[PDB]
Design goal:
With 302 residues, the chain is α/β, with parallel strands linked by helices. It has a single domain, classed as Alpha-Beta Barrel (TIM Barrel). Helix content is 40%, strand content 17%. It is globular. The structure holds a molecule of 3 linked components (XYP-XYP-XYP). The site of a molecule of 3 linked components (XYP-XYP-XYP) has 10 residues, from strand 3. It is classed as family 10 xylanase.
Length: 302
C-alpha cells in the first residue's frame, strides 16, 4: 500500500473514484495486493467473474461463485463496483453464439441480463451493458447479437437493464476511443446521439484506454469528443499504458480531471505481473507490488 491514496486525491477534485480490478486469485495471492486495493483505490471491476462464460456457462444455469466473492469483497470494503460485462461477442459460451432464431436470442439475452443484474441489484454503481460492439471504422460489429437480432439489440439490452436495476448507471464500453477524429470515436458518438434521441437509456460511455507509450496526450481530446454524444457521464474504464511513463499517466489523469463528464478512472490491474499485458509493464505497481514512478507522479499532480 502506498501511503498516499490517488483515489482519495482524485475524489478531492470532485471525481467519484480512481479504481482498479480484482477477483479471487489476485485478492488472495499475497498480502500486498488486497492491501493496495483497500488503501489506494476506491472502486473495483471484476476482471473475469461477471462475463457471460463465467456466469451462464449453460443455458439458464448460472454460476455466481466468483462474482459473489468480488462483489462481497468490494461491498465489505467500501469500494464502488462496475459490473462487467453483460453483452459481448468475446468470452461468450458456444450455446449463445449458435442461436439463430431472433426471438430465442432476445429471450436468452433478457434472461441473462435480468438474472445477473437482479443478483446484485442496488450494489452496482455502473454496468457495462454492451461491450465492444463497434468495428474500427465506426460501423456495428457483426456479432451474433447484431447478426440475429439486428440493431434493436442495443435498445433491448439497455431497456431491460434500466428496468431491472434503475439504480445502476448503464454504459456502452469500447476500446480505441483514444483520439478525437478517430473513426471509432466518430462512430461511437453518432450512434449514441441517435440512440439517446430514440429514448434508449444510455447513461454513460466507457473508454477502455489500453494505450501504447506516448499515447496519453491524445486522450483529453478523445474524452472531449465523446462528451458530444450527449450521455450524462463518461469514464476511463480499463486504463493501462505500455511502459507506464509518468508523462503518459499524468496526461490521462488530467484528461479525465479536466472533463466534467468524466466521473472516474479504473486502472486495468494493480501490479505488473498480474497484468493481461504484463510484458509491457503497463501498471502503477511493480513486480514487488511497490508504487512505480507514475503512481507518485499521479499523486503529485492531484
Ligand atoms: O480463462 C480466462 C482467460 O481467458 C481470461 O483472460 C482475460 C481476458 O479479458 C481481460 O479483460 C478484458 C481486457 O479487454 C477488454 O476489452 C475487456 O472488456 C476486459 O474484460 C482479462 O484481463 C484477461 O485476464 O481471464 C482469465 C480466465 O478467467
Amino acid at each position: 500500500q502506498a501511503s498516499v491514496s490517488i483515489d482519495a486525491k482524485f475524489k478531492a477534485h470532485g471525481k467519484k473514484y480512481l479504481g482498479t480490478i480484482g477477483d479471487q486469485y489476485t485478492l488472495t495471492k499475497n498480502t500486498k495486493n488486497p492491501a493496495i486495493i483497500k488503501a489506494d483505490f476506491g472502486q473495483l471491476t471484476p476482471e473475469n467473474s461477471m462475463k457471460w462464460d463465467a456466469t451462464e456457462p449453460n443455458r439458464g444455469q448460472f454460476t455466481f461463485s466468483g462474482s459473489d466473492y468480488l462483489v462481497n469483497f468490494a461491498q465489505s470494503n467500501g469500494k464502488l463496483i462496475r459490473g462487467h460485462t453483460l453483452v459481448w461477442h468475446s468470452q461468450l459460451p458456444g450455446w449463445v453464439s449458435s442461436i439463430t432464431d431472433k426471438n430465442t436470442l432476445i429471450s436468452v439475452l433478457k434472461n441473462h441480463i435480468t438474472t445477473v443484474m437482479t443478483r446484485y441489484k442496488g450494489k452496482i454503481y455502473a454496468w457495462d451493458v454492451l461491450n465492444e460492439i463497434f468495428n474500427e471504422d465506426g460501423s456495428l460489429r457483426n456479432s451474433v447479437f447484431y447478426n440475429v437480432i439486428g440493431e434493436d439489440y442495443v435498445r433491448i439490452a439497455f431497456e431491460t437493464a434500466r428496468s431491472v436495476d434503475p439504480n445502476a448507471k448503464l454504459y456502452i464500453n469500447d476500446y480505441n476511443l483514444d483520439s478525437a477524429g478517430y473513426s471509432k470515436v466518430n462512430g461511437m458518438v453518432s450512434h449514441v446521439k441517435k440512440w439517446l434521441a430514440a429514448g434508449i437509456p444510455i447513461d454513460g460511455i466507457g473508454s477502455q484506454t489500453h494505450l501504447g507509450a506516448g499515447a496519453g496526450s491524445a486522450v483529453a481530446g478523445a474524452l472531449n469528443a465523446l462528451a458530444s454524444a450527449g450521455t450524462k457521464e463518461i469514464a476511463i474504464t480499463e486504463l493501462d499504458i505500455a511502459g507506464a511513463s509518468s508523462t503518459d499517466y499524468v496526461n490521462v489523469v488530467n484528461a479525465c480531471l479536466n472533463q466534467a463528464k468524466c466521473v472516474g478512472i479504473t486502472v486495468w490491474g494493480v501490479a505488473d505481473p498480474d497484468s493481461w499485458r504484463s510484458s509491457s509493464s503497463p501498471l502503477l505497481f511493480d513486480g514487488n507490488y511497490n508504487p512505480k514512478a507514475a503512481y507518485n507522479a499521479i499523486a503529485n499532480a492531484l
